[PDB]
Amino acid sequence: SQSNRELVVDFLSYKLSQKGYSWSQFMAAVKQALREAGDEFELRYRRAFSDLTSQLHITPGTAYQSFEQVVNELFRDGVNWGRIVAFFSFGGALCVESVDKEMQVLVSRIAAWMATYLNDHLEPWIQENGGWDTFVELYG
């Protein structure tokens, strides 16, 4: 059970932190840099971000192809870290729209679409461009 290991890591991280120690997982710093980069993006690029987010509205009927086509425009002539942050913020905005319209069910699906798009399209660029460690150093 992946599940059981996760519960154990959560408890031990809590207990160590409660004693004034710090036991961070390898993806801890990546997560934090991404939250901060996404916040800064949405605050810096309100106009461009709105234009991005207005290009797609997710309904129970939407397929991945529709999401992929809009994200493909974002990366059509290649990848940079700024565009990767835009892709996260864009997913975020689609999830918020979904929940504003009481379609909470769509959040899971958007998460799977984002994970697929990362795996197929962005992870190979990231592994040739210094890994998520380079992102943390650039944005964290």
Binding site: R44, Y45, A48, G78, V79, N80, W81, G82, R83, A86
Partner: peptide, 11 residues
């Protein structure tokens, strides 16, 4: 990449 968004300028 060719700069098309304001965030491409920081790269």
């Amino acid at each position: 990449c060719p700069a098309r968004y304001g965030w491409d300028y920081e790269c």
